[PDB]
Coordinates of all heavy atoms in Angstrom, one line a residue:
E1096 N -56.6 115.8 -48.7 CA -56.8 116.2 -47.2 C -57.8 115.3 -46.7 O -57.7 114.9 -45.5 CB -57.1 117.6 -47.0 CG -55.8 118.5 -46.8 CD -56.1 119.9 -46.5 OE1 -57.4 120.4 -46.5 OE2 -55.3 120.6 -46.4
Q1097 N -58.7 114.8 -47.5 CA -59.7 113.8 -46.9 C -59.2 112.4 -46.9 O -60.0 111.5 -46.3 CB -61.0 114.1 -47.7 CG -61.8 115.2 -47.2 CD -62.4 116.1 -48.4 OE1 -62.4 117.3 -48.3 NE2 -62.9 115.5 -49.3
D1098 N -58.2 112.0 -47.7 CA -57.8 110.6 -47.7 C -56.4 110.5 -48.3 O -56.1 110.2 -49.4 CB -58.7 109.7 -48.7 CG -58.7 108.3 -48.3 OD1 -57.9 107.9 -47.5 OD2 -59.5 107.6 -48.9
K1099 N -55.4 110.9 -47.4 CA -54.1 111.2 -47.8 C -53.3 110.0 -48.0 O -52.2 110.1 -48.7 CB -53.5 112.1 -46.7 CG -52.2 112.8 -47.2 CD -51.7 113.7 -46.0 CE -50.4 114.4 -46.5 NZ -49.6 114.9 -45.3
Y1100 N -53.7 108.8 -47.5 CA -52.9 107.6 -47.8 C -53.2 107.0 -49.1 O -52.3 106.8 -49.9 CB -53.2 106.6 -46.7 CG -52.5 105.3 -47.0 CD1 -51.2 105.1 -46.6 CD2 -53.2 104.2 -47.6 CE1 -50.5 103.9 -46.9 CE2 -52.6 103.0 -47.9 CZ -51.2 102.9 -47.5 OH -50.7 101.7 -47.7
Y1101 N -54.5 107.0 -49.6 CA -54.9 106.4 -50.8 C -55.0 107.4 -52.0 O -55.0 106.9 -53.2 CB -56.3 105.7 -50.7 CG -56.3 104.5 -49.7 CD1 -56.7 104.6 -48.4 CD2 -55.8 103.3 -50.2 CE1 -56.8 103.5 -47.6 CE2 -55.8 102.2 -49.4 CZ -56.3 102.3 -48.0 OH -56.3 101.2 -47.3
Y1102 N -55.1 108.6 -51.7 CA -55.1 109.7 -52.7 C -53.9 109.6 -53.7 O -52.7 109.6 -53.3 CB -55.1 111.1 -52.0 CG -54.9 112.1 -53.1 CD1 -56.0 112.7 -53.8 CD2 -53.6 112.6 -53.4 CE1 -55.8 113.7 -54.7 CE2 -53.4 113.6 -54.4 CZ -54.6 114.2 -55.0 OH -54.5 115.1 -56.0
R1103 N -54.2 109.5 -54.9 CA -53.1 109.6 -56.0 C -53.2 110.9 -56.7 O -54.2 111.3 -57.2 CB -53.4 108.4 -56.9 CG -52.1 107.9 -57.6 CD -52.3 106.7 -58.5 NE -51.9 105.5 -57.9 CZ -52.8 104.5 -57.5 NH1 -54.1 104.5 -57.8 NH2 -52.3 103.4 -56.9
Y1104 N -52.0 111.5 -56.6 CA -51.9 112.8 -57.4 C -52.1 112.3 -58.9 O -51.7 111.3 -59.3 CB -50.4 113.4 -57.2 CG -50.2 114.3 -56.2 CD1 -49.4 113.9 -55.1 CD2 -50.8 115.6 -56.1 CE1 -49.0 114.7 -54.1 CE2 -50.4 116.4 -55.1 CZ -49.6 116.0 -54.1 OH -49.3 116.8 -53.0
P1105 N -52.7 113.3 -59.7 CA -52.9 112.9 -61.1 C -51.6 112.8 -61.9 O -50.8 113.7 -61.9 CB -53.8 114.0 -61.7 CG -53.8 115.1 -60.7 CD -52.8 114.7 -59.5
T1106 N -51.4 111.7 -62.5 CA -50.1 111.5 -63.2 C -49.0 111.0 -62.2 O -47.9 110.8 -62.5 CB -49.7 112.8 -64.0 OG1 -50.3 112.6 -65.3 CG2 -48.2 113.0 -64.1
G1107 N -49.4 110.8 -60.9 CA -48.4 110.7 -59.9 C -48.8 109.6 -59.0 O -49.5 108.5 -59.3
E1108 N -48.4 109.7 -57.7 CA -48.3 108.6 -56.7 C -49.3 108.9 -55.4 O -49.5 110.1 -55.2 CB -46.9 108.3 -56.2 CG -46.1 107.6 -57.3 CD -44.7 107.3 -56.9 OE1 -44.0 108.2 -56.2 OE2 -44.2 106.1 -57.2
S1109 N -49.6 107.8 -54.8 CA -50.2 107.8 -53.5 C -49.2 107.3 -52.4 O -48.2 106.6 -52.8 CB -51.4 106.9 -53.4 OG -51.0 105.6 -53.7
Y1110 N -49.4 107.5 -51.2 CA -48.6 106.9 -50.1 C -48.7 105.3 -50.3 O -47.7 104.6 -50.0 CB -49.1 107.3 -48.7 CG -48.5 108.5 -48.2 CD1 -48.9 109.8 -48.7 CD2 -47.4 108.4 -47.4 CE1 -48.3 110.9 -48.2 CE2 -46.8 109.7 -46.9 CZ -47.3 110.9 -47.3 OH -46.7 112.1 -46.9
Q1111 N -49.8 104.9 -50.8 CA -49.9 103.4 -51.0 C -48.9 103.0 -52.1 O -48.4 101.8 -52.0 CB -51.3 103.1 -51.5 CG -51.6 101.7 -51.7 CD -53.0 101.5 -52.2 OE1 -53.6 102.3 -52.9 NE2 -53.6 100.3 -51.7
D1112 N -48.8 103.8 -53.1 CA -47.8 103.5 -54.1 C -46.4 103.4 -53.7 O -45.6 102.5 -54.0 CB -47.9 104.5 -55.3 CG -49.3 104.5 -56.1 OD1 -49.8 103.3 -56.2 OD2 -49.7 105.5 -56.6
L1113 N -46.1 104.4 -52.8 CA -44.9 104.4 -52.1 C -44.4 103.1 -51.4 O -43.3 102.6 -51.6 CB -44.9 105.6 -51.2 CG -43.8 106.5 -51.0 CD1 -43.1 106.8 -52.2 CD2 -44.2 107.8 -50.3
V1114 N -45.3 102.6 -50.6 CA -45.1 101.3 -49.9 C -44.6 100.2 -50.9 O -43.7 99.5 -50.7 CB -46.4 100.8 -49.2 CG1 -46.2 99.4 -48.8 CG2 -46.8 101.7 -48.1
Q1115 N -45.3 100.1 -52.0 CA -45.0 99.1 -53.1 C -43.5 99.3 -53.5 O -42.8 98.4 -53.7 CB -45.9 99.1 -54.4 CG -47.3 98.7 -54.0 CD -47.5 97.3 -53.4 OE1 -47.7 97.2 -52.2 NE2 -47.3 96.3 -54.3
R1116 N -43.1 100.5 -53.9 CA -41.7 100.7 -54.3 C -40.7 100.7 -53.2 O -39.5 100.4 -53.4 CB -41.5 101.9 -55.3 CG -41.9 103.3 -54.9 CD -41.4 104.2 -55.9 NE -41.9 105.7 -55.7 CZ -41.2 106.6 -55.1 NH1 -40.1 106.3 -54.5 NH2 -41.6 107.8 -55.0
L1117 N -41.2 100.9 -52.0 CA -40.2 100.8 -50.8 C -40.1 99.4 -50.3 O -39.1 99.1 -49.5 CB -40.7 101.8 -49.7 CG -40.5 103.2 -50.1 CD1 -41.1 104.1 -49.1 CD2 -39.0 103.6 -50.2
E1118 N -41.0 98.5 -50.6 CA -40.9 97.1 -50.2 C -39.5 96.5 -50.4 O -38.9 95.9 -49.4 CB -41.9 96.2 -50.8 CG -42.3 94.9 -50.0 CD -41.3 93.8 -50.4 OE1 -40.5 94.0 -51.4 OE2 -41.4 92.8 -49.7
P1119 N -38.9 96.7 -51.5 CA -37.5 96.1 -51.7 C -36.5 96.9 -50.8 O -35.4 96.3 -50.5 CB -37.2 96.4 -53.1 CG -38.5 96.5 -53.8 CD -39.4 97.1 -52.8
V1120 N -36.8 98.1 -50.3 CA -35.9 98.8 -49.4 C -36.0 98.2 -48.0 O -34.9 97.9 -47.4 CB -36.2 100.3 -49.4 CG1 -35.3 101.0 -48.5 CG2 -36.0 100.9 -50.9
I1121 N -37.2 97.9 -47.6 CA -37.5 97.2 -46.3 C -36.8 95.8 -46.3 O -36.1 95.5 -45.3 CB -38.9 97.0 -46.1 CG1 -39.7 98.5 -45.8 CG2 -39.2 96.0 -45.1 CD1 -38.9 99.3 -45.0
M1122 N -37.0 95.1 -47.3 CA -36.4 93.8 -47.4 C -34.9 93.8 -47.3 O -34.3 93.1 -46.6 CB -36.8 93.1 -48.7 CG -36.8 91.6 -48.7 SD -38.0 90.9 -47.4 CE -39.6 90.7 -48.2
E1123 N -34.3 94.8 -48.0 CA -32.8 94.9 -47.8 C -32.4 95.5 -46.5 O -31.3 95.0 -46.0 CB -32.2 95.7 -49.0 CG -30.7 95.8 -49.0 CD -30.0 94.4 -49.3 OE1 -30.5 93.7 -50.1 OE2 -29.0 94.2 -48.6
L1124 N -33.1 96.4 -46.0 CA -32.8 96.9 -44.7 C -32.8 95.9 -43.7 O -32.0 95.8 -42.8 CB -33.9 98.0 -44.3 CG -33.6 99.4 -44.0 CD1 -32.1 99.8 -44.2 CD2 -34.6 100.3 -44.5
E1125 N -33.7 94.9 -43.8 CA -33.7 93.7 -42.9 C -32.5 93.0 -42.9 O -32.1 92.4 -42.0 CB -34.9 92.8 -43.1 CG -36.4 93.4 -42.7 CD -36.5 93.8 -41.2 OE1 -35.7 93.3 -40.4 OE2 -37.5 94.5 -40.9
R1126 N -31.9 92.9 -44.2 CA -30.6 92.1 -44.2 C -29.4 92.8 -43.7 O -28.4 92.2 -43.3 CB -30.3 91.7 -45.7 CG -31.3 90.9 -46.4 CD -30.7 90.3 -47.7 NE -29.5 89.5 -47.3 CZ -29.5 88.3 -46.9 NH1 -30.6 87.5 -46.8 NH2 -28.5 87.7 -46.5
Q1127 N -29.5 94.2 -43.6 CA -28.3 94.9 -43.2 C -28.2 95.0 -41.7 O -29.0 94.6 -41.0 CB -28.4 96.3 -43.8 CG -28.4 96.5 -45.3 CD -27.0 95.9 -45.8 OE1 -26.0 96.1 -45.2 NE2 -27.1 95.1 -46.8
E1128 N -27.1 95.6 -41.3 CA -26.9 95.9 -39.9 C -27.0 97.4 -39.7 O -28.2 97.9 -39.6 CB -25.6 95.3 -39.4 CG -25.6 93.8 -39.4 CD -24.6 93.1 -38.6 OE1 -23.9 93.8 -37.7 OE2 -24.5 91.9 -38.6
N1129 N -25.9 98.1 -39.7 CA -26.0 99.6 -39.4 C -26.2 100.3 -40.8 O -25.4 100.1 -41.6 CB -24.8 100.1 -38.7 CG -24.6 99.4 -37.4 OD1 -25.4 99.2 -36.6 ND2 -23.3 99.1 -37.0
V1130 N -27.3 101.0 -40.8 CA -27.6 101.8 -42.0 C -28.1 103.1 -41.7 O -29.0 103.4 -40.8 CB -28.7 101.0 -42.8 CG1 -28.9 101.7 -44.2 CG2 -28.4 99.6 -43.0
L1131 N -27.6 104.0 -42.5 CA -28.1 105.5 -42.5 C -28.9 105.7 -43.9 O -28.3 105.5 -45.0 CB -27.0 106.4 -42.5 CG -27.3 107.9 -42.7 CD1 -28.3 108.4 -41.9 CD2 -26.0 108.8 -42.6
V1132 N -30.2 106.1 -43.8 CA -30.9 106.3 -44.9 C -31.3 107.8 -45.0 O -31.9 108.3 -44.1 CB -32.2 105.5 -44.9 CG1 -33.0 105.8 -46.1 CG2 -32.0 104.0 -44.7
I1133 N -30.8 108.5 -46.0 CA -31.1 109.9 -46.3 C -32.1 109.9 -47.4 O -31.8 109.7 -48.5 CB -29.8 110.6 -46.7 CG1 -28.7 110.2 -45.6 CG2 -30.0 112.0 -46.8 CD1 -27.3 110.8 -46.0

């Protein structure tokens, strides 16, 4: 609650970790045209 972006769950991820794995999603999204992401 005090630092929700950088906080890493133990054995788990932070929002910061999320950006790293989503980077290739963003890069492919930029190549696409119409996309629905669920």
Side-chain angles (χ1 to χ4, degrees):
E1096 269 180 359
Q1097 278 135 226
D1098 201 358
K1099 193 181 182 198
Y1100 178 81
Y1101 294 102
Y1102 170 86
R1103 201 174 265 118
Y1104 275 111
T1106 274
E1108 287 183 318
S1109 64
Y1110 274 77
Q1111 182 181 36
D1112 291 331
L1113 219 42
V1114 169
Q1115 295 303 104
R1116 54 177 171 94
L1117 291 169
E1118 200 277 349
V1120 177
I1121 287 323
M1122 207 61 91
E1123 184 62 43
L1124 241 12
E1125 292 297 342
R1126 298 199 55 87
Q1127 293 300 317
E1128 293 199 8
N1129 300 317
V1130 187
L1131 170 55
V1132 181
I1133 308 176

